[PDB]
Amino acid sequence: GPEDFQQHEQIRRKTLKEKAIPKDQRATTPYMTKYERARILGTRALQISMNAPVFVDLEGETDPLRIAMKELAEKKIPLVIRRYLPDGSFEDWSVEELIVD
Amino acid sequence: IVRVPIALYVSLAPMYLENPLQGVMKQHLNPLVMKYNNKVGGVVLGYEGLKILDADPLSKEDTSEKLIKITPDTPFGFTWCHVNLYVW
């Protein structure tokens, strides 16, 4: 019942914390990979085309992918890449934290 | 009137990607008012103490910047939440 769900949730969150790798010891590439850039652009374009608040100033453009590229140029994309290690461990890099090319 | 703490799994809209608390409230919690629920066991008379869980476990719970997991094929985000419901 409620307590069974409580212990299930506790086990799930404990496993999640045991899998997360803290910011002070991640050993992945500092750069943003091409796949990461493409998916971050696609997801940000989806979000803005779904009537999300925007930060950069529109120059009359109406292509959501172009607006997402403008945001990536201005480093205004509020997204996090969760790079998954083979065993399930994950490092949460930020878009601004990564260096594009 | 019994206070029943529950854990939700709700969707977050890109329109509400800037005030996720009010987004979750208006998407899910506000409809539940004055409507009987097949899970809790009574008509919900209100809510309070809505706290959104974090997709990053190492983040301190006192922080104000939490992570929501975006659907791979949709700009919507799904996250776990905790909230107390006033149930009659």
């Binding site: 409620p2 | 019994v2 206070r3 029943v4 703490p5 854990a7 939700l8 409809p31 809790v40 066991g41």
Partner: peptide, 18 residues
């Protein structure tokens, strides 16, 4: 209705009604 936009995916009781 009943899309994943008005109703939660799962409602789980955290603890007994208190």
């Amino acid at each position: 209705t009943a899309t994943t936009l008005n109703t939660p995916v799962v409602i789980h009781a955290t603890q007994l009604p208190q």
